[PDB]
């Protein structure tokens, strides 16, 4: 039972810290770029779990629901983050402050370029809409949450975060109609993010089985998504 203004601040406080990784000394190859990505991701996944647990009410869901939600949305959340980080840097993908990939660098890994392009396209769209930080916080949480006691609780949590986004938009002062248009515009983009994550997951699974990159521990568990698949 918390107001939207209060939930936004809570989300702000829950934001994961920046993961610092750097380009390898030697130039990139398919294998080393992928390696860097998996190393970055494993650290980010750890942070994602901590973030999730700071979302009011999340830990009250069934453990089964908590696992399924994270297993289904993780790549999408990682991508949403990457989009935010890259928002003011056209043509670039800011995976990490010191790991900034240029679009063309996608050529280093077979089939990643078209996905990078998808990523840059959606990022461009968010930039043109002038996505605000607080809006991003709400949307990111929305991605996790939109992915009987526990069901009831989840629906309530999704509603809370939705209400927060509505609140954030309303403080901009624009007309009711433009507020609605903005909201729709943002949510509509979300399907583009989901799409990118679907292609990213497919691609990553390929990279793994083509033994281009080794996938272990937390990343592997989440990628396999055994609990989610049942």
């Amino acid at each position: 039972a918390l107001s939207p203004e209060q939930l936004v601040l809570t989300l702000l406080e829950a934001e994961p810290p920046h993961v610092l990784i750097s380009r390898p000394s030697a130039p990139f190859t398919e294998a080393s770029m992928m390696m860097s990505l998996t190393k970055l991701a494993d650290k980010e996944l750890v942070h994602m779990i901590s973030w999730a647990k700071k979302i009011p009410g999340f830990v009250e869901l069934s453990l089964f629901d908590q696992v399924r939600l994270l297993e289904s949305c993780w790549m999408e959340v990682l991508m949403m983050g990457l989009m935010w980080r890259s928002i003011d840097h056209p043509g670039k993908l800011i995976f990490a402050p010191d790991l900034v990939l240029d679009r063309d660098e996608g050529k280093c890994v077979e089939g990643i370029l078209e996905i990078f392009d998808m990523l840059l396209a959606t990022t461009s769209r968010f930039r043109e809409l002038k996505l605000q930080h607080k809006e991003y916080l709400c949307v990111k949480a929305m991605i996790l949450l939109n992915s009987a006691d526990s069901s009831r609780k989840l629906a309530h949590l999704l509603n809370a975060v939705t209400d927060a986004l509505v609140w954030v938009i309303a403080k901009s002062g624009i007309s009711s109609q433009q507020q609605s248009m903005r909201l729709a515009n943002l949510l509509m983009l979300l399907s583009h993010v989901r799409h990118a994550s679907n292609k990213g997951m497919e691609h990553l699974l390929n990279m793994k089985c083509k033994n281009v990159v080794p996938v272990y521990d937390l990343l592997l568990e989440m990628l396999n998504a055994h609990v989610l698949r049942g």
Partner: peptide
């Protein structure tokens, strides 16, 4: 481990 981390 995702399990350990959530149960934590």
């Amino acid at each position: 481990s995702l399990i350990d981390l959530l149960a934590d």
